[PDB]
Design an enzyme around this catalytic site. Sequence first.
Site, PDB file in Angstrom:
ATOM      1  N   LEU A 124      14.951 -39.463  -9.098  1.00 36.05           N
ATOM      2  CA  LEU A 124      14.810 -40.217  -9.843  1.00 36.05           C
ATOM      3  C   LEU A 124      14.325 -39.481 -11.098  1.00 36.05           C
ATOM      4  O   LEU A 124      14.536 -40.080 -12.484  1.00 36.05           O
ATOM      5  CB  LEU A 124      13.148 -40.058  -9.234  1.00 36.05           C
ATOM      6  CG  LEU A 124      13.180 -41.215  -8.203  1.00 36.05           C
ATOM      7  CD1 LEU A 124      11.348 -41.577  -7.909  1.00 36.05           C
ATOM      8  CD2 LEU A 124      13.184 -42.823  -8.195  1.00 36.05           C
ATOM      9  N   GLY A 125      13.843 -38.108 -11.087  1.00 33.88           N
ATOM     10  CA  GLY A 125      14.002 -37.117 -12.376  1.00 33.88           C
ATOM     11  C   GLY A 125      14.564 -36.053 -11.614  1.00 33.88           C
ATOM     12  O   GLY A 125      14.012 -35.333 -10.741  1.00 33.88           O
ATOM     13  N   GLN A 126      14.357 -35.395 -13.002  1.00 34.93           N
ATOM     14  CA  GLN A 126      14.920 -33.547 -12.668  1.00 34.93           C
ATOM     15  C   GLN A 126      13.695 -32.676 -13.603  1.00 34.93           C
ATOM     16  O   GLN A 126      13.794 -33.242 -14.763  1.00 34.93           O
ATOM     17  CB  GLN A 126      16.147 -33.513 -12.712  1.00 34.93           C
ATOM     18  CG  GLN A 126      16.956 -33.844 -12.143  1.00 34.93           C
ATOM     19  CD  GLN A 126      19.189 -33.774 -12.175  1.00 34.93           C
ATOM     20  OE1 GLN A 126      19.031 -33.408 -13.709  1.00 34.93           O
ATOM     21  NE2 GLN A 126      20.125 -34.150 -11.527  1.00 34.93           N
ATOM     22  N   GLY A 127      13.765 -31.868 -12.997  1.00 37.60           N
ATOM     23  CA  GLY A 127      12.520 -31.088 -13.294  1.00 37.60           C
ATOM     24  C   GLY A 127      12.925 -29.224 -13.144  1.00 37.60           C
ATOM     25  O   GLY A 127      14.169 -28.879 -12.928  1.00 37.60           O
ATOM     26  N   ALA A 128      12.310 -28.315 -14.252  1.00 35.50           N
ATOM     27  CA  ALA A 128      12.825 -27.131 -14.036  1.00 35.50           C
ATOM     28  C   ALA A 128      12.212 -27.043 -12.683  1.00 35.50           C
ATOM     29  O   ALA A 128      13.350 -25.812 -11.230  1.00 35.50           O
ATOM     30  CB  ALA A 128      11.786 -26.045 -14.417  1.00 35.50           C
ATOM     31  N   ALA A 153      11.080 -27.964  -9.523  1.00 33.35           N
ATOM     32  CA  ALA A 153      11.453 -29.308  -8.591  1.00 33.35           C
ATOM     33  C   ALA A 153      12.384 -31.101  -8.657  1.00 33.35           C
ATOM     34  O   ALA A 153      11.911 -30.728  -9.875  1.00 33.35           O
ATOM     35  CB  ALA A 153       9.817 -29.749  -7.878  1.00 33.35           C
ATOM     36  N   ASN A 154      12.754 -30.844  -8.139  1.00 37.90           N
ATOM     37  CA  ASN A 154      13.399 -32.530  -7.860  1.00 37.90           C
ATOM     38  C   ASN A 154      12.655 -33.536  -8.182  1.00 37.90           C
ATOM     39  O   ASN A 154      12.104 -33.223  -6.721  1.00 37.90           O
ATOM     40  CB  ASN A 154      14.498 -32.904  -7.351  1.00 37.90           C
ATOM     41  CG  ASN A 154      15.430 -31.715  -7.687  1.00 37.90           C
ATOM     42  OD1 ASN A 154      15.426 -30.970  -9.085  1.00 37.90           O
ATOM     43  ND2 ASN A 154      16.687 -30.673  -7.346  1.00 37.90           N
ATOM     44  N   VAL A 155      12.595 -34.344  -7.313  1.00 41.69           N
ATOM     45  CA  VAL A 155      12.263 -36.369  -7.108  1.00 41.69           C
ATOM     46  C   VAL A 155      13.048 -37.036  -6.983  1.00 41.69           C
ATOM     47  O   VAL A 155      13.982 -37.531  -7.310  1.00 41.69           O
ATOM     48  CB  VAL A 155      10.615 -36.785  -7.971  1.00 41.69           C
ATOM     49  CG1 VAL A 155      10.286 -37.739  -7.553  1.00 41.69           C
ATOM     50  CG2 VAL A 155      10.167 -35.716  -8.651  1.00 41.69           C
ATOM     51  N   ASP A 195       1.881 -30.831 -21.267  1.00 40.18           N
ATOM     52  CA  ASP A 195       3.427 -31.274 -20.906  1.00 40.18           C
ATOM     53  C   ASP A 195       2.982 -32.781 -21.558  1.00 40.18           C
ATOM     54  O   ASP A 195       4.497 -33.504 -21.279  1.00 40.18           O
ATOM     55  CB  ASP A 195       3.904 -30.340 -20.008  1.00 40.18           C
ATOM     56  CG  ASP A 195       4.838 -30.506 -20.031  1.00 40.18           C
ATOM     57  OD1 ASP A 195       5.863 -29.296 -20.442  1.00 40.18           O
ATOM     58  OD2 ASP A 195       6.202 -31.641 -19.619  1.00 40.18           O
TER      59      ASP A 195
HETATM   60  O1  LIG Z   1       6.726 -35.439 -12.142  1.00 44.76           O
HETATM   61  C1  LIG Z   1       8.302 -34.828 -12.673  1.00 44.76           C
HETATM   62  N1  LIG Z   1       9.064 -36.563 -12.902  1.00 44.76           N
HETATM   63  C2  LIG Z   1       8.279 -37.584 -13.509  1.00 44.76           C
HETATM   64  C3  LIG Z   1       9.596 -38.589 -13.255  1.00 44.76           C
HETATM   65  C4  LIG Z   1      10.289 -38.181 -11.887  1.00 44.76           C
HETATM   66  N2  LIG Z   1       9.277 -38.354 -10.860  1.00 44.76           N
HETATM   67  C5  LIG Z   1       8.943 -39.347 -10.673  1.00 44.76           C
HETATM   68  N3  LIG Z   1      10.043 -40.985 -10.837  1.00 44.76           N
HETATM   69  C6  LIG Z   1       9.324 -41.917 -10.227  1.00 44.76           C
HETATM   70  N4  LIG Z   1      10.086 -43.500 -10.050  1.00 44.76           N
HETATM   71  C7  LIG Z   1      11.222 -43.858 -11.179  1.00 44.76           C
HETATM   72  C8  LIG Z   1      11.724 -42.609 -11.977  1.00 44.76           C
HETATM   73  C9  LIG Z   1      12.386 -43.067 -12.996  1.00 44.76           C
HETATM   74  C10 LIG Z   1      13.076 -44.715 -12.762  1.00 44.76           C
HETATM   75  C11 LIG Z   1      13.127 -45.487 -12.566  1.00 44.76           C
HETATM   76  N5  LIG Z   1      13.814 -46.384 -12.230  1.00 44.76           N
HETATM   77  C12 LIG Z   1      14.256 -47.176 -13.194  1.00 44.76           C
HETATM   78  C13 LIG Z   1      15.054 -48.579 -12.916  1.00 44.76           C
HETATM   79  C14 LIG Z   1      14.522 -48.803 -11.513  1.00 44.76           C
HETATM   80  C15 LIG Z   1      14.088 -47.413 -11.280  1.00 44.76           C
HETATM   81  O2  LIG Z   1      13.857 -47.163  -9.360  1.00 44.76           O
HETATM   82  C16 LIG Z   1      12.119 -44.564 -11.167  1.00 44.76           C
HETATM   83  N6  LIG Z   1       8.111 -42.037  -9.540  1.00 44.76           N
HETATM   84  C17 LIG Z   1       7.336 -40.948  -9.641  1.00 44.76           C
HETATM   85  C18 LIG Z   1       7.504 -39.646 -10.051  1.00 44.76           C
HETATM   86  C19 LIG Z   1       6.508 -38.998  -9.820  1.00 44.76           C
HETATM   87  C20 LIG Z   1       6.718 -37.761  -8.923  1.00 44.76           C
HETATM   88  C21 LIG Z   1       5.288 -38.748  -8.525  1.00 44.76           C
HETATM   89  C22 LIG Z   1       8.704 -33.857 -12.638  1.00 44.76           C
HETATM   90  C23 LIG Z   1       9.934 -33.411 -13.065  1.00 44.76           C
HETATM   91  C24 LIG Z   1      10.165 -33.226 -11.719  1.00 44.76           C
HETATM   92  C25 LIG Z   1       9.051 -33.427 -11.202  1.00 44.76           C
END
Ligand SMILES: O=C(NCCCNc1nc(Nc2cccc(N3CCCC3=O)c2)ncc1C1CC1)C1CCC1
Lengths: 629, 629
Positions: A18-22, A24-26, A138
Amino acid sequence: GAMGQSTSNHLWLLSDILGQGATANVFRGRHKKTGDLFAIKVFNNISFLRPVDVQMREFEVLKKLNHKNIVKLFAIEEETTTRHKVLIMEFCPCGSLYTVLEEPSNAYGLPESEFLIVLRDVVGGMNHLRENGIVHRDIKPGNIMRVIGEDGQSVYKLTDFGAARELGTEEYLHPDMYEGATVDLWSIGVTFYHAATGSLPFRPFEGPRRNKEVMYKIITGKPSGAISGVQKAENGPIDWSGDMPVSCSLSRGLQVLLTPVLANILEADQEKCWGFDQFFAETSDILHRMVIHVFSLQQMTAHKIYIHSYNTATIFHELVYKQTKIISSNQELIYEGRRLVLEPGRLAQHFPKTTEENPIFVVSREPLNTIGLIYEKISLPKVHPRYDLDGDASMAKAITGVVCYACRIASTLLLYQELMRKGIRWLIELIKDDYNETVHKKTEVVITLDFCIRNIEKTVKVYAAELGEISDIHTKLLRLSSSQGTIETSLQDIDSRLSPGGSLADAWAHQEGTHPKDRNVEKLQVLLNCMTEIYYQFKKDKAERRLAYNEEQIHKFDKQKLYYHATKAMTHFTDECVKKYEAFLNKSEEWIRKMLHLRKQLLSLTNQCFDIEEEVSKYQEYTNELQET
Amino acid sequence: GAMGQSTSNHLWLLSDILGQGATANVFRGRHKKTGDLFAIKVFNNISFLRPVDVQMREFEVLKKLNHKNIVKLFAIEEETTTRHKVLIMEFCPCGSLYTVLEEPSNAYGLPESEFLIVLRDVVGGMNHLRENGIVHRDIKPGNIMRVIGEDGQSVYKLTDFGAARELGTEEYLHPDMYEGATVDLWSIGVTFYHAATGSLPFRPFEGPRRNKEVMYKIITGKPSGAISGVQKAENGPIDWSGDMPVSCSLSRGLQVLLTPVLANILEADQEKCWGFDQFFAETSDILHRMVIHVFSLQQMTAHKIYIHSYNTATIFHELVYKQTKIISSNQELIYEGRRLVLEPGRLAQHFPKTTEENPIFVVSREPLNTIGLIYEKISLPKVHPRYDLDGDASMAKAITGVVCYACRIASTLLLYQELMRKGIRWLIELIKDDYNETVHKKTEVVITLDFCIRNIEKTVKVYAAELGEISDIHTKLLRLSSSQGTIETSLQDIDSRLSPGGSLADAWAHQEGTHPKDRNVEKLQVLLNCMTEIYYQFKKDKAERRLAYNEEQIHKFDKQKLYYHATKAMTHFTDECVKKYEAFLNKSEEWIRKMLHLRKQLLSLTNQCFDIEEEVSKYQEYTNELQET
Ligand SMILES: O=C(NCCCNc1nc(Nc2cccc(N3CCCC3=O)c2)ncc1C1CC1)C1CCC1
Ligand SMILES: O=C(NCCCNc1nc(Nc2cccc(N3CCCC3=O)c2)ncc1C1CC1)C1CCC1
């Protein structure tokens, strides 16, 4: 089909990221038993940092914390093998605010409704963090999550805060933090400007690279309340502005309220900066207001007047004057075919139902200049033959965003013309109503007159000085009959003007501009769909970081196809949409002048009927009420 | 990354497969030089059949053949190795009519606009085939291609015809062909019924299996003009109907025209069947008509009246009477706040601009029953715990189609209520206009009277039998003054009824039903989106023909999730949308009766003012015009 990590109740693939951070990762992951989707937060590099004792309670705090604007932390578990700390978070399938701003449709800013939703959810979530005492600093479109609510509207949730203890974004950093709740409001301000504009407030020429030294010199000046500053050449002067750009899609009514807010939360000085209570008070003041749609036929402009539910028509007229520059006593309202009268103390609650497609029209007596829609003329960026995947992707976003804007403008032009057509039809029907009432006043006067002259002529008929007394009246009432006769005729001239083909007919308007049946906006959307498809494909080509020989040439082809689509759209926009709109505006000016001329003349004729009405009250009692025993 | 065939100028993957037919297959392929997409038709099993000489010219015919409603054949090439005959066809990315009908939104029939497009393109394409002399007979939603036009509207193109020389669909077969241009019209009829209904006209209980012997006994009867026949139990009676089902989304106006067309092209007898010229004439007659939107406040029903551009308001009133059962002389039109008057010979060209959201309202004098919207009450199909992929996919389509229908109905309920609100507001403003005009007539009468009684009282004042003559008039004019006085008062009672909170106010309507701000339709669409996502996933699970242990359980979960979504939607639809609509309809009946009562009374009062107006013309000359030398 590769390996992924897992926990006693959960499991996930590393491919699904989902996302990459410093820290942690998600990952996108599922529960073992129920199979429901969750966001799994896995700590990268933990060991030296981790506390069994302190971080236990730290996570136990965020757990029971619950809100609509904050992503829910459900549990804290350990990965099966590595025993790494893993947070089980609420999954948000729609992505984040960044994902929203990456859509070319939002290249020049979010829609008004969507921006207000962002402002609402962000403020509410930030305020809930205030009530607990937790600071964020942030706040970035990247950490502002978005989900689809039950009612279809977006709901924005904050995430990733409180790392300022155990352990802001680069262009979202405060000048001193670049080198206290002020830093919060700064990241907020840059975020809010980004959402409304589709661009960062402060942009050097090179960018956020090594040459970002200029950025600090940009932020350092802090001149006035200016909300943005951009240098258009390498290492040169900076263009400052305390107002939104023309490409902004927000209403004038919204901008007037928003500009000061962004102005006071964006500066280095702690003297002129706000506080969360002041910020909350001003932002919530904006959010509490209802919206009344008003179209000014004179200037041919749509307006969103932001009013509290408890305000009156007095303050309503003031706001309308603030936007349309029409004096409060000159504003004549029209709603659904009929003119509308508002009591000076009538509340905003009971105002008629309003939409952009069905506003309260405003016609005036004093002549006004037709302004029409004011938009920024944007053209296509030049396309390089270079094969750079990143460059192709960025260019694809930009050129599609340009077409999206033109499509937006075209949709508004049609709305203005369609409202211009409705307002004209209602106005002529209203003028017809005025003609009929004036006719009624004339019929009364001529009846009163014809009755006063006959009674006096019967007086001389039946039953020295007397015949002299009655003769003054004979001469007086005759003059009134001739004048009444002339008025009676020039009113029939006005009726000849109000007749079909009378030279004030609205036949022209349908002819002059564009109509919904032309399907101009749908044609742009078709080309916009082809472009947005090639766009998202170029994004996936960027992700790979390489392409096979086949996909290489297909990429090179669709890049040239992306250009021909855009040029086709802009050509259609300028030749077909703009031109026909211009001509409609030009022929609107002329009708307005003729219309204003006719209403003035009818007014004088109506005033003259009142005069001969009040002049026959001084005679009909003159000799008929003669006295004797 | 596998092997695919290719030709000197073209290449394609076998994995990319568009359609499968008996003689040939069609692949998604690209040109070698330009990379543009094309439909490649590769003949399967050719050898015995193929003619170098005959088929050369056969393909040379279809080549230069060009039309908007027929898929373009660009060239004939040979595959590199096998030297197989390969046709290079125009690619249609949107799929076919079958692909369109497979969408759950079209489970109970295509939208009206889309159905008309289908009827248009099919007829035009079929007629172009007629002009060349080529017969099709195989016309099926599967071979009717669909593309997106420049104006965003769908364009349907025919394909795969003329195989009746060198070499119809099963449920699209004619009874005798099941065992002549009649067979063409049959496949057409079944196709058209399918597009409008979302189902085949003739359905046995078992289906098109071995037990399809029943189907022939169904088709064999050919009773009346009936357009459909269905047996609801295994090997039992057949339910016939010569009319569209209630679930149909087409307008009453369209159905009245369509039913006879489908009735005459669907039967075995060559005696009662049509011809392509007759069929073209009737279908084109339908397509040439413009549409006027009319809402009947009395019955609370929306109507689409299909009129030719050259017709008059006479035939317009007739059609309106045909639908609303309101006599031509009782129809009172209202448009944009004001009543609308139409000349009996006024053409349809110059009729005011009309939309479903902005129709011509129709109020009547004679009392009428409020019908409201008539729709078919559809509930969810039972869901099995069985893991059958095909069964899960079919069930997923059905249950989503049910929710789509409920969402459609809900969107119409809101439209009816919103139009009901607009029409009421315009009506009360119109009744207010009538009150004001009646008041004006009274002011004239009372002025005339007050002037006749004073002149006569002055006659007896100044200057045996005479005092007897004037006394009859004194008694006569006094009676008129008292009656005029009473009328003057009961009119002020009507004004008290028309005042805010007068017991005829429209305050209730906003209160009684649902509003756009409730966002009911958007809530259904959210759940509908989750369902349609699980639906398309079940389709892909069907395609695999198997699933891994993981995907197996995820499938089993989302199947139960599909149910809870649907039940949630239908519960919301019935409890929130329907109930509030019902109550709005019930409180609409009462207001209508009160409204009709008030207008009747005002009419009598207006008539009484005309009476006292014409009764004072017979007196004001009676003694004031006395004769002498
Ligand atoms: O909390 C962070 N980052 C925020 C973004 C990554 N974390 C999360 N990502 C989605 N869901 C998500 C993130 C990105 C994209 C999509 N998309 C886009 C198209 C389809 C799809 O599933 C869905 N939910 C929830 C979350 C947070 C965890 C509750 C920090 C950076 C690493 C930790
Ligand atoms: O002509 C036939 N069949 C009709 C269907 C298959 N033939 C064709 N298929 C598409 N395009 C097509 C067919 C199906 C699906 C899709 N879809 C749906 C989703 C995405 C997509 O590309 C696109 N175009 C065009 C054509 C015809 C060749 C001109 C006969 C049966 C085999 C020969």
